[PDB]
Amino acid sequence: SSQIRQNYSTDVEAAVNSLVNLYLQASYTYLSLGFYFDRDDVALEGVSHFFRELAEEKREGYERLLKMQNQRGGRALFQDIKKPAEDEWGKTPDAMKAAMALEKKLNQALLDLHALGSARTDPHLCDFLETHFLDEEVKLIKKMGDHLTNLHRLGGPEAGLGEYLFERLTLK
Template sequence: MVAQLHEYTKKQRGCPALPAALFDHGGEPRGSYRGPRGFAFTLAFTPATLPVPSAMLPAPPSQVRQSYHPDCEAAINSHFNLEFHASSVCLAAAVYLYRYDVALKHFSWFFVRRSLEHSGWARRLMRLQNQRGSRIRFQDIGRPVSIEWKSGLKAMKCTLFLEKFVNRSLRHLHQLAIDKSDPHLHRFLATHYSSQQVAFISELEGHVTTLSMMGAPDVDLAGSLFEKLTLGDSDKKN
């Protein structure tokens, strides 16, 4: 059974919490996340309408489908929609940070690249669904609730919060592939996906720590120096 994702509307100091759970085998939510202080941020799409496998609309059987558990199929569908949402949040942050009255160009390109990575992974997962003979199910993504982050540090904290949520969904997919004896799915995730997600979270945590130690966001110069010396060098390499 694939549990429905729940979207919490109760605000924590101006920050709506993300959904409390992804899926688990008993169909009940477990665990919770709380957003960083001062962010008006929530998951914009509402995947609560995602039916469990037994309630899916009838579809003609695929001739290429073989040994693909319905729970794995539904979980992949939900995760690529989450990737699209993460892409839209990163793109919104990039647009805000590029504004003339914010003028953090290197921060902006940092989030543009991450937005493209998220949408790229969503496309790869959809391609995987086609290869396995699955039926792709799109959900309403919606616009990001927050479109202003006030500083590069706050945008990174917000993104770190979201990336950990994406990583939790990914860990669930890994475990589901093991539990349902799907070596192809497990190998795909382990080889092409997990290490990149963990590496980015580590990089993001390092940036947040460095900015905080420099006094951002209270010290305006700290964010500007970090942008030019750290993110600027990264842009040159890319």
């Protein structure tokens, strides 16, 4: 068994492995979104680049959870990363609803993991998730809420001109 392990319960370890797999499913979903918005028939380089950044932020996320999973004397153990549910994400608002719904699911799994770390009395886990996960998700779900409101504002009969001006003028 690990010689460094302390307060790190078997169910906090299993909930961190579950969260790592969920953050990997999120990077893999933002990989799918990030390449979908760069298809020739979709062609939204700023929306692609936005999800390319989110795939990177979720990647720094699971690598930072795995770094902690090792520092607590846990076992990093790996499940299949299930495919992103959608092969084609459709219009920019409906894809970004699915992005925010994914990120609210990660934020739920962080809040559930933090509630578990509180119930198991694990201060370093609670610190870790507070320091650079809960504020990652709250800022990013806010940023996607802003984008979804601007894409809703830009919706209606002008439709595609809204997608274009969104991508050009917010997502650079």
